[PDB]
Amino acid sequence: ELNDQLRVRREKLKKIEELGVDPFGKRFERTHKAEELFELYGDLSKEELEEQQIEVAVAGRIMTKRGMGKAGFAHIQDVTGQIQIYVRQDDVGEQQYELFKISDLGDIVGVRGTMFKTKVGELSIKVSSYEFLTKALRPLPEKDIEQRYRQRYLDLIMNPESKKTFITRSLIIQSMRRYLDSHGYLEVETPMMHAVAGGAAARPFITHHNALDMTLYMRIAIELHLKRLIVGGLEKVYEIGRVFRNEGISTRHNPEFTMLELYEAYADFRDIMKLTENLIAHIATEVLGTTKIQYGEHLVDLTPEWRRLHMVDAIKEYVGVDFWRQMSDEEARELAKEHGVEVAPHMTFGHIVNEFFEQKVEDKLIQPTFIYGHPVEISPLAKKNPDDPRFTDRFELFIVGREHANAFTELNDPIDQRQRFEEQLKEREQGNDEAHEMDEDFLEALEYGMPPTGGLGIGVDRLVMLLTNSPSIRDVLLFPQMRH
Amino acid sequence: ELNDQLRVRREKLKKIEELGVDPFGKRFERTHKAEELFELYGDLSKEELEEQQIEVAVAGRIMTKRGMGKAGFAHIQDVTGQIQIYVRQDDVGEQQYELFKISDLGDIVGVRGTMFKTKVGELSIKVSSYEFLTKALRPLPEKDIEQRYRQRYLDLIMNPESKKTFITRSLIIQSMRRYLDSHGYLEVETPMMHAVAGGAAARPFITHHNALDMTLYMRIAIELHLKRLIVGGLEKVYEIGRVFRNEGISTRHNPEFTMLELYEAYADFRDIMKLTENLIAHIATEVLGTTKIQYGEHLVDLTPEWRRLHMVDAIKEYVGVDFWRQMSDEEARELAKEHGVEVAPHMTFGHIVNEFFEQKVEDKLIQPTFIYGHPVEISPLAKKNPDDPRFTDRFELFIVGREHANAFTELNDPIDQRQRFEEQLKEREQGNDEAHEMDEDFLEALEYGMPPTGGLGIGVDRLVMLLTNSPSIRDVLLFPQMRH
Ligand SMILES: Nc1ncnc2c1ncn2[C@@H]1O[C@H](COP(=O)(O)OP(=O)(O)OP(=O)(O)OP(=O)(O)OC[C@H]2O[C@@H](n3cnc4c(N)ncnc43)[C@H](O)[C@@H]2O)[C@@H](O)[C@H]1O
Ligand SMILES: Nc1ncnc2c1ncn2[C@@H]1O[C@H](COP(=O)(O)OP(=O)(O)OP(=O)(O)OP(=O)(O)OC[C@H]2O[C@@H](n3cnc4c(N)ncnc43)[C@H](O)[C@@H]2O)[C@@H](O)[C@H]1O
Ligand SMILES: NC(=O)[C@@H](N)CCCC[NH3+]
Ligand SMILES: NC(=O)[C@@H](N)CCCC[NH3+]
Ligand SMILES: [Mg+2]
Ligand SMILES: [Mg+2]
Ligand SMILES: [Mg+2]
Ligand SMILES: [Mg+2]
Ligand SMILES: [Mg+2]
Ligand SMILES: [Mg+2]
């Protein structure tokens, strides 16, 4: 097992050093990637290749190897795929051949040679120069799901498919910045360490600054500092960055994740709905070529315009209870009991409406849907709806049964905002340890005047999951948080 | 007094509501920015303007106001600048004119009207519709440095040159990603919360995950996880993200900053030198239009190729001391005493060489200089130079007397690497509380084989300071860390 093959690999390490070669290599110049070779010469016949003597230089990890006396084959793998190499002793010389023979699966090498096809028609490289680049002290794993996440590098090597999800992830984010940049939004960087962790309902990670002897909280949202920039007059700003929440992991939750937050002065949540469907459609179109995608067993149509549905109307359609009716908190609690909806001590009418939605409705929303009108009690930073103040002009985007975005007509009334924070502090006294805390610096900012604004927050990891048909967030994160 | 002004603004808020207006506004559609207006017709005589009746719609903060009677003026400011508005009671009507009259400096408004020039020919908007958008409860500052950092929004409103710095910052980062993307590097996101804080010599911020009951350290570098991706076979990766160091602030230090870390398989530190100068020169050319820049009292030429200077040769040129000669630790300590170079208990020849450089040489490196050959003792993750192993194939980029980048031919030998960490542990016991920790997970990764690689780390904030002629990092960070 270990120390077994391990001792052998250490032994070969010394043998290589004794042959006057650096077992960990120097720089190496390549001319092609494996895939490029196939694209360019894959359809040429054995004869055509012999007549063109195309010389190339490539490098990669040895994945397979078969020795045959004075000559041998091996498949080396680079970031684009595998290419077979053929090494003959009489061609590369005794010294280089000795290096080929001592080479192990896992070792990394560089080669120069001419393109040719074997009798089975496999495009290969007839090696003229064999360069040893790096000795692998451990063998490639036996070719479990957890190892893929615990040791991502092994996943990337053994499951060539896996890298594609991450390449696509980069294209998704680049497409996102392209759209926002071209539409006038300024990409900014605001603090990730806050005096007060606000902007969302979540438990924060607490830390300490030694030199300044100060308690800091990793940000649970980007909202409050971006709003300060709107007060500052920047008008259109966005930030795609890490957010941290001290909470358990799930197929859709990781303690550190990437969120897009953006704010636009002079817009309201209806404008943000349009921006959201356009942005996501733009991304899907550029990256996948279409807005009609497959996710799990669902055919999801991301083609704008998406469905708009008030949360109360959603509960009426999917459950049957009509919360448009003015009722007491006690009446709402009774309904919750009758319909199997779990509620907490601090909850009143608004919280209960939301619980009805989350527990009995949201998982049925497969096609992109803008659920709007969130009760005021759970929307401390959103402006109340003018017609019915029990609700706010806020919406959440639901796709394949989960929330992908959250946005609102931002609350810019400082007096109302202070009141919302006071109500949140009261909720905390009643058991809601996720309630928003007071932020006087933020209220001060609002007092200098924040224009009417439309704000948006998108879970980038979740969007990447949707567009790559990944069932878990652990599949779109290179190094997801692992349990002890 | 200020207290008096607050009461007044508080009462005006009530009078506006009494006028049936939402004092915090609704969405407002605009057609132009203040600067666009001047660009499109800042020279068009009042005649043509009067004939064309060019209707426009803008919005912004009232910075100045003047006039009495049934006609008045005001200068509103948007993200691009200021534009004078002319409001006449006989045009907008009684109710709207009353709103104009009650409007305070600081309040935000939207207007629709036609372009025109006053007697003095000042481009202005002849208002046809006056929309009150937001009441400022606090007065704008009457037209302190640290105060501008504490309330960045006030700075952005009162000082237009500051906002430009941040717009330029975004352009610099955009230009950086374009270059890297176009040169084949894959943009990735790796963990910011680590089991073991490694990749640099620095004190970490410590935190705790409750549900997992796990101690986590905010990353002090991005290196170790990116190296895992190189083992993973990704070949070219980069990440521009936040890094956290539990240390005091300075003219070029903030507890959380942005760093670019990049790794390229099959390249060495010389290749990285070229990449670094080409990248920075590219960004300068794109953003400033030239590689000739000004920083403080210095004229800095960023045109490649930059000077390459070995640390030992730099000390010889500036201090008159030669460290190429083989010498004992005591001989080095003797030289340190003679030249007034402070040293710590855990220091030997290698550390002392670096102390000579940092204490007597670095501040004089104004023009871009690649200082290379750092002693192995202070380079635990860099490969030793083949000809003189007392030094490593590492370089730091110095410009205007400070370090902007750190890079090396990566140490891919797992056996050597473990030994480097062991020597680091020894130093920690000798008083070096910034010594690197023993990362078994990282060592395991190298044991599967990491190809020869060239790595780079650039302080983005410092690069932004350089290209925006900002004397402090506090000038290029929207919200720099404030003291208590
Ligand atoms: N820790 C947990 N473990 C298991 N189940 C849990 C759970 N927390 C909640 N659930 C369950 O998931 C369902 C919905 O819960 P909700 O609490 O209503 O929604 P959420 O998934 O927690 O996102 P959040 O409400 O915080 O979004 P936010 O606007 O702040 O932020 C904006 C966007 O950021 C993204 N986002 C938020 N948190 C994220 C995370 N930790 N990881 C990745 N993305 C995240 C999302 O796209 C979100 O729309 C319910 O069944 C609930 O019980
Ligand atoms: N906190 C402090 N306050 C006052 N004086 C101090 C100080 N720390 C050091 N000094 C003094 O500055 C001079 C040089 O000290 P050094 O310790 O050699 O320089 P450094 O600025 O600390 O860069 P470092 O070595 O940590 O960067 P790294 O490659 O790891 O990482 C790669 C790149 O990241 C950037 N970077 C590193 N730390 C940063 C930070 N905290 N903020 C912004 N950028 C940073 C840089 O561009 C660096 O090249 C000496 O006089 C020293 O005493
Ligand atoms: N929940 C959150 O993280 C919010 N800060 C996302 C943005 C909502 C609209 N302002
Ligand atoms: N000291 C640091 O932060 C290094 N991780 C910067 C990169 C050096 C080259 N690998
Ligand atoms: Mg949550
Ligand atoms: Mg939610
Ligand atoms: Mg949400
Ligand atoms: Mg430092
Ligand atoms: Mg240094
Ligand atoms: Mg440095």
Curated annotation (Swiss-Prot), chains A, B:
GO CC terms in record: cytosol
Enzyme class: ligase
One of the GO biological process terms: lysyl-tRNA aminoacylation
Binding residues for Mg(2+) 2: E403
Top-level taxon of the source organism: Bacteria
One GO MF term attached to the UniProt entry: ATP binding
Keywords for the protein's UniProt record, in alphabetical order: Aminoacyl-tRNA synthetase, ATP-binding, Cytoplasm, Ligase, Magnesium, Metal-binding, Nucleotide-binding, Protein biosynthesis
Necessary cofactors: Mg(2+)
Binding site for Mg(2+) 1: E396, E403
Family annotation (SUPFAM superfamilies): Class II aaRS and biotin synthetases, Nucleic acid-binding proteins
Location in or out of the cell: Cytoplasm
Cofactor note: Binds 3 Mg(2+) ions per subunit.
Cross-referenced InterPro entries: Aa-tRNA-synt_II (IPR004364), aa-tRNA-synth_II (IPR006195), aa-tRNA-synth_II/BPL/LPL (IPR045864), Lys-tRNA-ligase_II (IPR002313), Lys-tRNA-ligase_II_bac/euk (IPR034762), Lys-tRNA-ligase_II_N (IPR044136), Lys-tRNA-synth_II_C (IPR018149), NA-bd_OB-fold (IPR012340)
Pfam family, one: tRNA-synt_2
EC number: 6.1.1.6
Catalytic activity of the protein: tRNA(Lys) + L-lysine + ATP = L-lysyl-tRNA(Lys) + AMP + diphosphate
Keyword Transcription carried by entry: no
UniProt similarity note: Belongs to the class-II aminoacyl-tRNA synthetase family.
Record's subunit section: Homodimer.
Official protein name in the record: Lysine--tRNA ligase
Organism: Geobacillus stearothermophilus (Bacillus stearothermophilus)
Lineage: Bacteria, Bacillati, Bacillota, Bacilli, Bacillales
Gene name tied to this protein: lysS
